């Protein structure tokens with residue numbers, strides 16, 4: 001056949017990811033014809049907001065692969081499909097963006113921060129209960145627009161997003177993982193395809209970044225047991241510290257009153273199980289009730 005079709009969302013960032021992948025494929029395979037098949041998603045207008053339609057495209061042979069930001073990828077996959085490649089992770093941190101202010105601790109009480117992330121919301125409320133967390137929706141550019149239009153005093157966004165769009169000057173301060181634990185796989189893009197499609201699987205191999213896969217498998221094992229998605233206040237971030245996966249996670253109330261934290265450290269080979277163990281520790285420590293709450 002020699003043709004690989006790529007299903008992707010049609011926002012500026014989504015298209016950046018499609019081209020990123022397309023280039024790495026052409027690099028390793030000079031004579032491969034890569035076709036982009038952009039499409040809209042429910043979230044742009046199961047929990048398949050930004051993914052369902054790409055999965056339908058994969059199941060109908062309308063595309064061969066689907067490109068997503070790892071944090072948008074669902075934990076459940078329909079019969080036949082699955083995540084097969086995890087690319088090199090970019091900066092996984094959240095970032096404080098603002099025009100008139102230089103930092104979070106410099107915002108006066110009452111300042112309006114924008115984010116619809118319950119994960120980001122719970123952590124800020126825990127430290128700065130005097131701040132107003134206002135919901136924000138839309139592509140990066142629309143979010144930046146609203147901030148410039150004075151609708152919010154500041155907004156929180158992923159560092160990986162702004163950097164890739166050449167808007168890294170908007171990053172007023174990259175928040176440390178300790179102060180804002182990243183969402184699962186933030187900073188990494190994942191490729192989904194038909195498990196039986198060996199042809200596509202082999203062509204995709206060269207794009208897999210082993211270390212990043214290790215980190216994200218652990219983070220996702222944690223989330224999968226917790227059966228969460230973007231709509232739940234869950235933090236999950238792993239690092240490769242001296243040949244060992246150091247996994248951290250949290251589940252907190254939107255108001256920031258109760259936040260359940262936990263950590264685990266072990267050999268790379270036990271990434272999935274350590275994530276599963278950590279998740280259960282959180283469940284028994286009250287996460288179950290907090291999650292049932294939301």
Ligand SMILES: *Cc1[nH]c(Cc2[nH]cc(CCC(=O)O)c2CC(=O)O)c(CCC(=O)O)c1CC(=O)O
Pocket residue numbers: 069070071072114115116117118119120136137156157158159160161183185186187188229230231
């Ligand atoms: C799961 C989830 N998705 C989003 C929206 C989103 N998805 C990808 C990006 C770009 C960064 C990346 O590639 O990882 C973004 C926007 C961004 O974070 O800059 C969210 C955020 C919703 C919000 O903050 O209003 C979430 C939930 C979460 O991050 O916890």
